């Protein structure tokens, strides 16, 4: 194809730029296929994600375009970024395929979970997580679906976040990975249907940090009813001021619950699971967990405050924390509608950009 070349990836074809060689499958939808590749120009490994049937239906087309627009609002090192987007077709008439090039990491948090870890590597990872999360929130993007499989890391302890504002899925994480369900890490206000805000991802991070320490999922609910039980059996029944905010019927069910008493955070996370001067850290860490793993969103720690926390504060770098997003996501897009062909163009222009 003059500037492109075909390569057979399973039952699928990848027509990519010549600069990308040694293509090989590492994940698979459903909604797309991801290949690890070598970028000759950059001398650097990349992840090439080919969207599957972005023009199949009006819904797919909206997702394809929306995904492009989302990664436009982001310019942070702790978040996955679009290294390149392209199509092997020459005109809008025959345009049908879209390819997304992203940085290729070595791992996701799941493979970190089982590792022993110390305070400097743990607190650093969390710091990056909070840095990437703040950037998203600044761009007007609240993740909500933060889980160890959509958080990727490299061997040099660098961290990036995947799948912000994507359905599950839809996104990149579902198609590959040691996969994990999002149910375990969703905040109370989400699962209880109360609506949410920025610090909904603070809960998520809380669940992730708890798993890093205990090397086991904190709230493995068989379903959302069981999920709620797991949460309250360990953290206790939330104050009345919280429950009054619930919807009528659900409020009663949750008020119908057996009043469980919360285990103390030193009990949930005994120093046994922790590692001397570096025992002040175990205090610092456990404390932080008591602010993130809060049921009431009003009584939960903010992203900003979490950055200021002694266990995290050691890493504070204003360049890493205050880096503004290139653009803010206009939510008035979600309610916009177009035909498949109209969507096809908006996407096409974005690619040729």
């Amino acid at each position: 194809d003059n500037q492109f070349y075909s390569v057979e990836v399973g039952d699928s074809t990848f027509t990519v730029l010549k600069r990308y060689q040694n293509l090989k499958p590492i994940g698979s939808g459903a909604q797309g296929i991801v290949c690890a590749a070598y970028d000759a120009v950059l001398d650097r490994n990349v992840a090439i994600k080919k969207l599957s049937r972005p023009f199949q239906n009006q819904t797919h087309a909206k997702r394809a375009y929306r995904e492009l627009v989302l990664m436009k609002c982001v310019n942070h090192k702790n978040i996955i970024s679009l290294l390149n987007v392209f199509t092997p077709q020459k005109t809008l008439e025959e345009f049908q395929d879209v390819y997304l090039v992203m940085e290729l990491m070595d791992a996701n948090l799941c493979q970190v979970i089982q590792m022993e870890l110390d305070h400097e590597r743990m607190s650093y990872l969390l710091y990056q997580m909070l840095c990437g999360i703040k950037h998203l929130h600044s761009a007007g993007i609240i993740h909500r679906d933060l889980k160890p499989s959509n958080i990727v890391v490299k061997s040099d302890c660098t961290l990036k976040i995947l799948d912000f504002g994507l359905a599950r899925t839809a996104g990149t994480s579902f198609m590959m990975t040691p996969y994990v369900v999002t149910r375990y890490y969703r905040a109370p206000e989400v699962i209880l249907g109360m609506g949410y805000k920025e610090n909904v991802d603070i809960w998520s991070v809380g669940c992730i940090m708890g798993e890093m320490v205990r090397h086991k999922i904190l709230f493995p609910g068989r379903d959302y009813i069981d999920q709620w039980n797991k949460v309250i059996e360990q953290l206790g029944t939330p104050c009345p001021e919280f429950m009054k905010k619930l919807q009528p019927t659900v409020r009663n069910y949750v008020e119908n619950r057996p009043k469980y008493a919360g285990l103390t955070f030193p009990k949930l996370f005994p120093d046994s699971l922790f590692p001397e001067h570096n025992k002040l850290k175990a205090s610092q860490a456990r404390d932080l967990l008591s602010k993130m793993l809060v049921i009431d969103p009003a009584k939960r720690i903010s992203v900003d405050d979490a950055l200021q926390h002694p266990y995290i504060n050691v890493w504070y770098d204003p360049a890493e924390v205050e880096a503004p997003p290139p653009q803010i996501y206009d939510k008035q897009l979600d309610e916009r509608e177009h035909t498949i062909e109209e969507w096809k163009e908006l996407i096409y222009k974005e690619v040729m950009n």
């Binding site: 070595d106 493979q111 590792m115 400097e120 590597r121 650093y124 061997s155 302890c157």
Partner: peptide
Amino acid sequence: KHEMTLKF
């Protein structure tokens, strides 16, 4: 420091 590692 910032020059930490982690192995898989």
